[model samples]
Target chain A: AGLAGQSRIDASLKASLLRAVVERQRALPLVLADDAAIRGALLSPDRPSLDRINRKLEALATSAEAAVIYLIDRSGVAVAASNWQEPTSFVGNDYAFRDYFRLAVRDGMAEHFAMGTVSKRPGLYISRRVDGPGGPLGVIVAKLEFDGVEADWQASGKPAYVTDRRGIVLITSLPSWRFMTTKPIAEDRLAPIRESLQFGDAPLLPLPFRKIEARPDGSSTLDALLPGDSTAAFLRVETMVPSTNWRLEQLSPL
Target chain B: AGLAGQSRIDASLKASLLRAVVERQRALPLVLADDAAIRGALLSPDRPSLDRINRKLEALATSAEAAVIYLIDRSGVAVAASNWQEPTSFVGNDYAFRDYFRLAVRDGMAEHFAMGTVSKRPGLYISRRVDGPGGPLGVIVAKLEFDGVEADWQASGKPAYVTDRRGIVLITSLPSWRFMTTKPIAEDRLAPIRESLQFGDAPLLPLPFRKIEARPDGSSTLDALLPGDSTAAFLRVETMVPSTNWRLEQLSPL
Candidate 1:
């Protein structure tokens, strides 16, 4: 029962910390989506207007401490981006097929956790549809990287991860645990996510943890193999992160 | 009838324009309120905690183009402000009597357009109440200057003003028109607002317009005295600014 108490407190603390970190960042995408210049440029993507927007996006990205900020037009093409001059500039890239753009077009807003197509970095993509008098002009996207969060978790010398509704890891203290499925993901289930290339070419393999038993308080015991030479049976504590469909889990050593 | 159509369209245009400007800015205060670091500091408020919050606030103010960003504790004391070291810094000020504070404490959020008590500059105050496990922690306040907005309105060589629910003019093109009432205010009602000191010691006098007559399409003919020696009857166009009870009014010379 002492282990039970420790695991429960640990799970809640991790979940609350992530929620607060994410809560404030949600504003950047919202403010960017409502930006007048961005909306106007979306209406007329002229050379001068696009140039002005790209510079503003770059400045805003730095000030907001965001990984990147980009504008996508109705056709799902990046018109202007903060990284307009970078080697991995998002400008002129096609994203009509991306879930963030397509989902927000129909739903007004959306969020997706994935490996960046250009930077190849893992982050959360937040998108909001910019509407016009006629209809939606386009969507604005902001990517948030969790390097610090992951680093801190790793420094704690314990394993932690966040997984989407599909049980595929989106973030983890074990760097290689990313994109791994906690449970078996059948080919039928994996095909759709693969078609979108949201996670790139990374094979969605299973985590090296076989569930041994479950407890009533949402903790599971698993026989695990980690860190190349480690083997143990540990208790997995899971907590639902606020306002998101993702679950944050931490491993408590036994 | 043609004048009627033009006046109506003009009012709608101005109101919509103002709406768009303010719509995007609302996100700043919200993001500030939900900021994990700010909330954490509001809980601790030690010397080091406040210093970090002040610096971040300053950086964010410049990035967001806001006049000021401040944090007020539950007791309505400005603890950390963007202009921490400036002569006009808001730190250590008591705002317990301010409407933006009182109204937001119970309402979760509130907006007040007023002349600044410290700087004497007028702007809209946006506030959001921060909550904790037990109850409210503090309120985050952001002030948005309308220097550009008013300058543009003034350049048009036309008179424009926004009035609150009580007909007290909060924003105007004419420099001397602020704090004036568009209509009569009884002493009973005037006393309360005056005591709040939200608009400073300015006498709430009536505007230089008499309601001449009403039109069918939300406009009124007014008798006006302007430029200190000019007198003219004009058509007053009024439109309710979206999401607020404030009415934005403009005058068309007859």
Candidate 2:
């Protein structure tokens, strides 16, 4: 019963993080999808219109608390970006092979987390399709870096993370664990992830989590090794995001 | 022009406040309306189940920074409340005459701001209908006090407020201005307001605002008297909340 209580509390914390991410995903799309000016610029690319779009994106990035906002043409070439003033501007960058770009073009929206080729930062990329009279015009992408969320988890003295379906840690309170896997990755999965350089040259080794007891409610007790080879009992709780296959996990000392 | 620049900035501030309020209104309803436990408790009252509902409401109030959460039966009597332990517990309180209750029952959902009869605090009441098997069962109410919102405005060194259609100050950064009117109230409006004890016999006189210029875009320049009888020019901006007929006003010092 005591273990169940601990698991319930951990589950609530994970649910909170999942809600935050889901909310951002719900909101960022409206920033571009409803804007006539943004759709117009994407449909007919031009220097002046692109400049206007860039300014709008910059304002939205700051106001929405996003790391970056960019527009990619149907060809998956960056047309305008919020970081136009920065030296690492994403403008003119080609992302045709990125999963987020391809999936958004195909399915109308998509989310993917990976390291940025230009900024070298790790963040979740949430993209939405911009449709025009002819067909799909481009994709509006918002990069949400979980630095503040991770800081909040650290402040609460809890370790939390979100992982994709493949068990790759896409976001984590512990920076050292990011891009790592919860379990050993199969060779087929590792080959594509490596080829795309999604995690650069970082090792995709399994985290040091040994399950003690697993409950049917997606909560578990585990022995986790911390820094300095210290092992501690932890209550691990998992919750799946509604629209995506990603799972949010929260760990609390037990 | 200088006036154009001032109007632009004031419009942006008004838009920001509108977005804040709109987002909260959009999100909080899902918290109660979608919860099967809450709906079930409201449909058929039981002691143990009501206790469980109160505990859930308390947790939500704490997490949402709301002052209180309560459920009112079709008769407008509170059946469960988050502040059950407090001396001014809302359980068993009859609120049949309150606009939040009456309007919510009539219109499916409603929002209003008034002084609490039990708590003696002024806050906005956001209410939603709880549907049952046959028809509406009760109204779920969340009291938003705006203390944190006022604190944020104070920290930013700006003045802002929200006013009802009658020009009564419903929410304000300055505590002194609450329940006061921006313009003089009519005798007919004052009589009913006094009878209901809405403003508690406080004079509903005009605020100390001398209009300098008014624009069609809902922005204005005014000379406002401060606490020390000193006056300063302020740019007043206003935005109407959709479906509520309330205006959010923000004032920036010139």
Candidate 3:
């Protein structure tokens, strides 16, 4: 009964963290899109303007709890960035292939979660189109790192995670489970994810969750056996995040 | 199956809301404790200083997403408030009888969810003790209103609510459910709740939930009969908020 109660608590905590991410992602675009200086700099890229915007972006990144903030021109080339002073600076990097940049150009706003090519860290990328006189001039991007949030979850002594539509674990309290899959991936999907280096050669295998019974409320009872021979039954709850198509899954031991 | 899936989603959403509230409450007290000016003002009350502190508190309230922030002396006399300009201002109000003020005086910090006597709104009161040269000076309280959060839930087309340990509804997406009870309360407990006017003499009766089955996982299946004769089987998930002993409950149709 204690374990059962813990599961509901775990589910609630995981949902809260993901909801915060969603709300932050939703609010970030509006702030970036409304900044006149950011929009002007994106339209006509120059050294002084880019430098000033880079400083502004850095300040915003710090205040907004984002890991990196940058502006990408219509051509998908990063013009200015918050990490300009760092060795792994994203400035001048081409992100045209990334969905966040591509979709933001077309749809005016977009969000995507993937491993950062430069920082080599996993983060959610939120992007918004910067409008100019003629058309959409560029995209402002913010990459949010959940290190603090994951740390808080870890401190709570619960195993919680979020998975994408394809069942690949995106955010987790367990470091070992990072980039792992909840279930095996099909060949077609595996190739593209590999080409993008999203998981960087990590084997995509099913997590050690054996289904026991399904409840009518969409939760399930499952036995999770960790590699260390610890066996426990958990109540698995899944919540679908709107707009992102992601599932926030939490497990509590029973 | 779809209804089952929705239940899991509802449980996750409710958990998220409660977790957010817990985290905010946890962080707020520390911020209040560390503010030197606030502590000094509570120790020595003056008109100019009090006005300055009130303005500062208003700024904090705006930034902290609180409905109002105020300071009460050890004797429970309100000295300064964020809403001093308003007719319903909390300044000069004696809150010695409020649990939040009394407990904060005793335990250094306290949290309580009750309907505001002055504003007539439901909110959570988070209070922290202010330390002076001799000892604890007064209590700094912040009231968090969830109207915006409830509106967000309503916008998502979900009927969600939270209840205290005694089953008294504290917050709900459906305003009609405010002050309602999930189960019958004992006369002894109901009398005090009424005496405090915490719920303003509302009838404390069981919500229209008929239990169908109980799960070891602490969740239950129930038939919820809504107004207008609509009835549905729902998966009732309840999570306990750690510090407050409150239950955050969500019912999803099955």
Per TM-score, the best of the predicted structures is: 1
Backbone collision count in every prediction? 0, 0, 0
Q: What lDDT tens digits, residue by residue, belong to model 3 across residues A106-206?
A: 99998878888888888888889989878888898888888877776666655678888788988887777777787778889888888876666677666
Q: Candidate 2 docking: what grade?
A: incorrect
lDDT of 3 by residue, B132-250 (tens): 87898899888888887787666554467888777888888777788888777888888777888666667766666676687766667888765564878777766665556677777
Model 2 residue pairs with clashes: none
Model 1 Cα displacement at A117 (Å)? 1.2
Better of 1 and 3 by lDDT: 1
> Residue B44 deviation, candidate 2, in Å?
50
Which digits, one per residue and each the tens of the lDDT, describe model 1 over residues A20-58?
A: 656656666676665567789999999998998887777
**C-alpha RMSD by candidate, in order:** 25.0, 16.3, 15.0
Error of 2 at B244 (Å): 28
Residue-wise C-alpha lDDT for candidate 2, range A59-166, written one tens digit per residue: 556535467889998888999999999999999999988888899899998887788899988987888888887788888888877787777676666688888888
Model 3 pairs in collision = none
Q: Considering only the true interface residues, what is the Cα RMSD of candidate 2 after superposition?
A: 12.5
Candidate 2 chain A lowest-lDDT run of ten: A22-31
User: Compared with the true structure, what per-residue lDDT tens digits does model 2 show for residues B1-254?
Assistant: 47546655654565476556545543454446545677888877899879877876664454443578898888889998989889999999998888888887888888777788889888778888888778888888888777766766655556777788889987777888787787678898788887886655667777767866887765678998656657898877767655566777777777
